[PDB]
Amino acid sequence: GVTVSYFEWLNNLNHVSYGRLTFKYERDSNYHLLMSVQESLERKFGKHGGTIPIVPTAEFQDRISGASEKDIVHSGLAYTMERSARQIMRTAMKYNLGLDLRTAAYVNAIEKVFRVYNEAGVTFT
Amino acid sequence: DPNFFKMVEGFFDRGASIVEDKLVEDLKTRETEEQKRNRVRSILRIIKPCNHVLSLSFPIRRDDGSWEVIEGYRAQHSQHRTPCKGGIRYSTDVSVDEVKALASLMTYKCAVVDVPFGGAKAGVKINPKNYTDNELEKITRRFTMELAKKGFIGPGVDVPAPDMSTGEREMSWIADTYASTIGHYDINAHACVTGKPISQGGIHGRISATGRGVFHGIENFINEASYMSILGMTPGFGDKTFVVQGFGNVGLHSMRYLHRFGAKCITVGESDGSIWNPDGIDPKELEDFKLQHGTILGFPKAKIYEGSILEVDCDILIPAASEKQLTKSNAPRVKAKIIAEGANGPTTPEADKIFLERNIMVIPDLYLNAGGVTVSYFEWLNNLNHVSYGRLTFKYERDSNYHLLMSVQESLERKFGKHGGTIPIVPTAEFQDRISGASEKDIVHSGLAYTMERSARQIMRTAMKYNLGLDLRTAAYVNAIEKVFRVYNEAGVTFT
Amino acid sequence: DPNFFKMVEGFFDRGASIVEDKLVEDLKTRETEEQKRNRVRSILRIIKPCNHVLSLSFPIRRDDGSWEVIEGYRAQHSQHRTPCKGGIRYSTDVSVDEVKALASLMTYKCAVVDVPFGGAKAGVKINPKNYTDNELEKITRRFTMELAKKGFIGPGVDVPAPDMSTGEREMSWIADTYASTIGHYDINAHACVTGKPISQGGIHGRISATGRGVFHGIENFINEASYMSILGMTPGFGDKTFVVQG
Amino acid sequence: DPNFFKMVEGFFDRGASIVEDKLVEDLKTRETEEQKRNRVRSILRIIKPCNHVLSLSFPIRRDDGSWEVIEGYRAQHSQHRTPCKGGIRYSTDVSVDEVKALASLMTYKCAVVDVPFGGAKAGVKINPKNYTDNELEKITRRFTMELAKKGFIGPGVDVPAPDMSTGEREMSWIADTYASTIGHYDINAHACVTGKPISQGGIHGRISATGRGVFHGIENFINEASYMSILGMTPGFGDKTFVVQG
Ligand SMILES: NC(=O)C1=CN([C@@H]2O[C@H](COP(=O)(O)OP(=O)(O)OC[C@H]3O[C@@H](n4cnc5c(N)ncnc54)[C@H](O)[C@@H]3O)[C@@H](O)[C@H]2O)C=CC1
Ligand SMILES: NC(=O)C1=CN([C@@H]2O[C@H](COP(=O)(O)OP(=O)(O)OC[C@H]3O[C@@H](n4cnc5c(N)ncnc54)[C@H](O)[C@@H]3O)[C@@H](O)[C@H]2O)C=CC1
Ligand SMILES: NC(=O)C1=CN([C@@H]2O[C@H](COP(=O)(O)OP(=O)(O)OC[C@H]3O[C@@H](n4cnc5c(N)ncnc54)[C@H](O)[C@@H]3O)[C@@H](O)[C@H]2O)C=CC1
Ligand SMILES: NC(=O)C1=CN([C@@H]2O[C@H](COP(=O)(O)OP(=O)(O)OC[C@H]3O[C@@H](n4cnc5c(N)ncnc54)[C@H](O)[C@@H]3O)[C@@H](O)[C@H]2O)C=CC1
3-state DSSP of chain D: CCCHHHHHHHHHHHHHHHHHHHHHCCCCCCCCHHHHHHHHHHHHHHCCCCCEEEECCEEEECCCCCEEEECEEEEECCCCCCCEEEEEEECCCCCCHHHHHHHHHHHHHHHHCCCCCEEEEEEECCCHHHCCHHHHHHHHHHHHHHHHCCCCCECCCEEEECECCECCHHHHHHHHHHHHHCCCCCCCHHHCCCCCCHHHCCCCCCCCHHHHHHHHHHHHHHCCHHHHHHHCCCCCCCCCCCCCCC
Chains A and D touch (3+ CB pairs under 8 A): no
Do the Cβ atoms of B123 and B196 come closer than 8 Å? no
Do the Cβ atoms of B42 and B24 come closer than 8 Å? no
Determine whether the interchain pair D182/B181 forms a contact, defined as Cβ–Cβ distance below 8 Å. yes
Cα(B171)–Cα(B198) distance, integer angstroms: 11
The alpha carbon torsion through D145, D150, D156, D162 (nearest 10 deg) reads -50
- Tell me, yes or no, if the two domains B1-51 and B52-200 fold the same way: no
Do the Cβ atoms of D98 and D72 come closer than 8 Å? no
B200: closest chain C residue by CA? C81
Q: Quick one: D241 exposed, middle or buried, by C-beta within 10 A (0-12, 13-18, 19+)?
A: exposed
Nearest to D85 by CA among D171, D172, D192: D192
Which contacts qualify for B292-301: CB closer than 8 Å, 24 or more apart?
B295/B270, B296/B247, B296/B268, B296/B270, B297/B272, B297/B273, B299/B275, B301/B277
Going D224 to D225 to D229 to D230, the CA torsion angle's sign is negative
Going C82 to C85 to C88 to C89, the CA torsion angle's sign is negative
Residues of C within an 8 Å Cβ radius of D: 35, 38-39, 42-43, 45-46, 49-57, 59, 65-69, 71, 146, 149-152
Give Rg (Cα) of chain B.
25
Elucidation technique = cryo-EM
Chains within contact range of chain B (3+ C-beta pairs < 8 Å): A, C, D
Chains within contact range of chain C (3+ C-beta pairs < 8 Å): A, B, D
Picking from C53, C65, C152, the nearest residue to D35 by CB comes out as C65
Chains B and C touch (3+ CB pairs under 8 A): yes
Calculate helix-pair angle for B283-290, B249-259, nearest 10 degrees.
150
Cα(B482)–Cα(D84) distance, integer angstroms: 60
Determine whether the interchain pair A121/C199 forms a contact, defined as Cβ–Cβ distance below 8 Å. no
Chains B and A touch (3+ CB pairs under 8 A): yes
Cα(B233)–Cα(C230) distance, integer angstroms: 63
Chain D residues with beta carbon closer than 8 angstroms to that of B181? 145, 181-182
Do the Cβ atoms of B58 and B125 come closer than 8 Å? no
Chain D residues with beta carbon closer than 8 angstroms to that of C146? 51
**Residues of B that are catalytic:** 121
Phi, psi at C232, each rounded to 5°: 105, 20
Cα B483 to middle of ligand 1, angstroms: 8
Which residue's C-alpha comes closest to atom 15 of ligand 2?
Answer: B249
Q: Which atom of ligand 3 is nearest to the CA of B202?
A: 17
Query: CB-based contacts of B85: which residues, under 8 Å, 6+ apart?
Result: B106, B110, B117, B118, B119, B120, B158, B159, B160, B161, B194, B373, B376, B377, B380
Determine whether the interchain pair A124/C176 forms a contact, defined as Cβ–Cβ distance below 8 Å. yes
Cα(B203)–Cα(B387) distance, integer angstroms: 11
Calculate helix-pair angle for A23-41, B394-412, nearest 10 degrees.
30
Closest ligand to Cα B115: 1
Cα(B74)–Cα(B124) distance, integer angstroms: 9
Do the Cβ atoms of B336 and B317 come closer than 8 Å? yes
Q: Which CATH superfamily is domain C52-200 in?
A: Leucine Dehydrogenase, chain A, domain 1 (3.40.50.10860)
Do the Cβ atoms of A104 and A97 come closer than 8 Å? yes
What fold does the segment set C1-51 form as a domain?
A: Helix Hairpins (1.10.287)
Closest ligand to Cα B440: 3
Phi, psi at B19, each rounded to 5°: -70, -20
Cα(C58)–Cα(B42) distance, integer angstroms: 64
Phi, psi at D180, each rounded to 5°: -120, -10
Give Rg (Cα) of chain C.
22
Nearest to C46 by CA among B34, A80, B86, D70: D70
Chain C residues with beta carbon closer than 8 angstroms to that of A113? none
Picking from B133, B179, B187, the nearest residue to C188 by CB comes out as B187
Cα B114 to middle of ligand 1, angstroms: 6
Going B280 to B285 to B291 to B295, the CA torsion angle's sign is negative
The alpha carbon torsion through B384, B388, B389, B390 (nearest 10 deg) reads -130
Angle among Cα B20, B21, B27 to the nearest 5 degrees reads 90
Q: A36: annotated binding-site residue?
A: no
Chain A residues with beta carbon closer than 8 angstroms to that of C141? 124
Chain D residues with beta carbon closer than 8 angstroms to that of B145? 180-181
Cα(B239)–Cα(B218) distance, integer angstroms: 15
Cα(D40)–Cα(D31) distance, integer angstroms: 12
B276: which DSSP letter? Answer: E
Cα(D185)–Cα(D179) distance, integer angstroms: 9
Q: Which atom of ligand 1 is nearest to the CA of A70?
A: 39
C121 a catalytic residue: yes
Nearest to B185 by CA among C83, D180, D58, C54: C83
Regarding beta strands B316-318 and B241-244, do their DSSP bridges make them parallel or antiparallel, or are they unpaired?
Answer: parallel
Nearest to D98 by CA among D7, D32, D182: D7
The half-sphere exposure of B148 on its side-chain side, counting CA atoms within 13 A, is 30
- Most distant CA pair in chain C: distance in Å? 70
B414: which DSSP letter? Answer: T
Cα D222 to middle of ligand 4, angstroms: 25
Query: Which CATH number does B201-496 carry?
Result: 3.40.50.720
Nearest to B26 by CA among B46, B10, B40: B40
Do the Cβ atoms of B74 and B81 come closer than 8 Å? no
First to last CA, chain D: 20
Query: CB-based contacts of B73: which residues, under 8 Å, 6+ apart?
Result: B53, B54, B55, B56, B94, B96, B99, B122, B123, B124
Determine whether the interchain pair B423/A22 forms a contact, defined as Cβ–Cβ distance below 8 Å. no
Q: C216: annotated binding-site residue?
A: no
Nearest to B142 by CA among B168, B166, B171, B173: B173
Query: CB-based contacts of B272: which residues, under 8 Å, 6+ apart?
Result: B295, B297
Cα(B148)–Cα(D23) distance, integer angstroms: 55
Residues with CB under 6 A from ligand 3: B 198-199, 204, 388, 391, 439-440; C 81, 110-111, 114-116
Chain B residues with beta carbon closer than 8 angstroms to that of A39? 428
Do the Cβ atoms of D85 and D106 come closer than 8 Å? yes
Do the Cβ atoms of C57 and D49 come closer than 8 Å? yes
Q: A75: annotated binding-site residue?
A: no
Query: CB-based contacts of C244: which residues, under 8 Å, 6+ apart?
Result: none
Cα C68 to middle of ligand 1, angstroms: 62
Query: CB-based contacts of C139: which residues, under 8 Å, 6+ apart?
Result: C58, C60, C70, C124, C126, C131
Phi, psi at A19, each rounded to 5°: 75, -5
Cα(C210)–Cα(C207) distance, integer angstroms: 8
Q: A11: annotated binding-site residue?
A: yes
Domain ranges of chain B: 1-51, 52-200, 201-496
Tell me the C-alpha to C-alpha distance, in Å, between residue C130 and each of B267, B493, C95, D42, D154: 84, 65, 19, 19, 39
Regarding beta strands C67-70 and C52-55, do their DSSP bridges make them parallel or antiparallel, or are they unpaired?
Answer: unpaired
Annotated resolution, angstroms: 3.3
Nearest to B377 by CA among B103, B81, B104: B81
Cα(B363)–Cα(D136) distance, integer angstroms: 59
HEC readout, chain C:
CCCHHHHHHHHHHHHHHHHHHHHHCCCCCCCCHHHHHHHHHHHHHHCCCCCEEEECCEEEECCCCCEEEECEEEEECCCCCCCEEEEEEECCCCCCHHHHHHHHHHHHHHHHCCCCCEEEEEEECCCHHHCCHHHHHHHHHHHHHHHHCCCCCECCCEEEECECCECCHHHHHHHHHHHHHCCCCCCCHHHCCCCCCHHHCCCCCCCCHHHHHHHHHHHHHHCCHHHHHHHCCCCCCCCCCCCCCC
Nearest to B84 by CA among B126, B60, B50, B57: B50
Query: Does B142 contact ligand 1 (Cβ within 6 A)?
Result: no
Phi, psi at D96, each rounded to 5°: -85, -15
Helix (H, G, I), strand (E, B) or coil at B357: coil
Most C CBs within 10 Å: which of D30, D37, D42, as the mutation test of the C interface?
D42
